[PDB]
Amino acid sequence: RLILPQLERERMAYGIKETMLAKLYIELLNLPRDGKDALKLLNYRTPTGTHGDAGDFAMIAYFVLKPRCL
DNA sequence: AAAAACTATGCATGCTCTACTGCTTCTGATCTAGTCGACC
Structure with missing residues (x-):
């Protein structure tokens, strides 16, 4: 099921x-509402941030969470 | 006849209820914008 969630x-x-x-x-995560990370996560489609992938929400989430998780 | 003791009283303090009025903050109801799931 995990391999094919659809x-x-x-x-x-x-x-x-x-x-x-x-x-x-x-x-x-208690991140700031108007902070860079929050805007990037919410506006994941916008490439203005030019932070790695600009269309993949999963990649943006992984980049944001890299220093926050074990 | 003269001095001392007891009682009346009375005015002022602080407390207490009781209420009234104002401001601050919490809860609930309603409206509007955004979001998800199913299909096609």
Whole structure:
């Protein structure tokens, strides 16, 4: 199921997507609301930040979380 | 006849209830914008 989440049927809809997941990450990590990391996570599509990948939300989240996790 | 002791009282303090009015803050209801899931 983890390898192919799209085929999951037993589990109900998560209800969280890129925007909601970014908001939850900002709230939990206690990052500043108007800080660079929060804007990058929320505006992951915008390439103005020129921080590695500009379209992949997962890559931006990994870059933001590299110094925050074990 | 003269001095001392007890009682009336009375005005002022601080406390207490009781209420009234104002400001600050918390809760709840409502409106509006954004988001997710399903399909096609």
